[PDB]
Amino acid sequence: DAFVGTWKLVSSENFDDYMKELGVGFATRKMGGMAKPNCIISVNGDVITIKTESTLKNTEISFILGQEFDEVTADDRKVKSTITLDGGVLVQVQKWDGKSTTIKRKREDDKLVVECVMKGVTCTRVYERA
Ligand SMILES: CSc1cnc(SCc2n[nH]c3cccc(OCc4ccccc4)c23)nc1O
Numbered sequence: 001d002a003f004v005g006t007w008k009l010v011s012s013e014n015f016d017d018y019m020k021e022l023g024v025g026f027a028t029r030k031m032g033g034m035a036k037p038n039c040i041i042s043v044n045g046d047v048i049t050i051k052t053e054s055t056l057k058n059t060e061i062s063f064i065l066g067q068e069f070d071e072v073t074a075d076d077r078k079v080k081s082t083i084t085l086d087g088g089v090l091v092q093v094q095k096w097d098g099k100s101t102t103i104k105r106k107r108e109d110d111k112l113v114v115e116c117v118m119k120g121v122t123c124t125r126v127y128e129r130a
């Protein structure tokens with residue numbers, strides 16, 4: 001849809017602080033901070049697929065809006081995820097151990113803007129079309 005495409009990371013703010021707030025250890029934060037991922041978003045009927053690709057790590061999720069699914073995150077958390085579309089924004093919540101984090105993906109001008117929140121920490125990652 002508005003989101004379908006191949007997106008390349010072009011800026012990031014506060015991603016280390018966000019990872020730290022999630023309890024990610026140094027080695028994984030180091031590799032994650034240095035990563036320059038592509039994000040490939042596709043849709044087929046009810047099912048949306050989001051691939052995140054980088055030199056040192058690839059991940060993928062596929063989901064139906066509103067239907068909770070199990071996910072293993074890049075930092076190896078075992079979470080329950082739900083994604084919904086609200087006002088043109090894909091809103092993802094991950095829940096694990098009584099905690100939650102939100103990841104909001106929006107389209108703004110030429111950008112795919114991703115806002116990641118854990119407690120008081122807010123990270124913004126910006127992608128542009130490949
Ligand atoms: C949600 S938004 C988002 C998510 N992940 C990435 S790159 C992940 C990655 N690529 N290579 C990597 C190599 C090592 C570690 C990585 O991640 C760690 C991480 C990701 C997320 C939460 C906590 C820890 C990576 N870009 C984004 O924009």
